[PDB]
Amino acid sequence: ASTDYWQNWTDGGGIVNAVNGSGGNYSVNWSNTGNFVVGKGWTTGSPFRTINYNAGVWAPNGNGYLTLYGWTRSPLIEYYVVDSWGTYRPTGTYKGTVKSDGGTYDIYTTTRYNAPSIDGDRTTFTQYWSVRQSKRPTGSNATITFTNHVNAWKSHGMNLGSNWAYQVMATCGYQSSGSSNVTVW
């Protein structure tokens, strides 16, 4: 499918050279950053969407995630489906596991306090995570069957909000450097 949303957010720290390429393609070169999220996807997320991507380059030198990323409002929730990472594997409060698209993911919940959100300003919100147990190899056509994650989260009392915001296949980083090139469809 054609992507219709371009996400390019940085808190202003360091260098974040994000390129909005042709179709669903984008690349990022980052150096000595603060927090940032770059990615392509859809303006309105869906719990039924099947996301396809191919990360031609996934080369983080530090803390960075290659992850499905999105938000819902009512309640405000930031969610992730992490396929690969750099030096740090994100974890939180363990809820259980889900097998999807050839991999096994651990399910975690964390909370952010006085942090930036899609609404602007700062607030406290919950984060839902599905983190692969082992890094998924990159360079190949990968699929994330999002429904499997949504259903598993629900079975663990992790309900998403009623108002869906954007949903993208992103490159997130925190105080690191690196490069990525990803195509989303």
Ligand SMILES: O[C@@H]1[C@@H](O)[C@H](O[C@@H]2CO[C@@H](O)[C@H](O)[C@H]2O)OC[C@H]1O
């Ligand atoms: O849409 C943008 C959001 O992506 C941003 O929220 C931060 C995203 O990075 C995560 O690591 C943080 O938890 C989260 O605060 O807020 C700005 C908004 O424009």
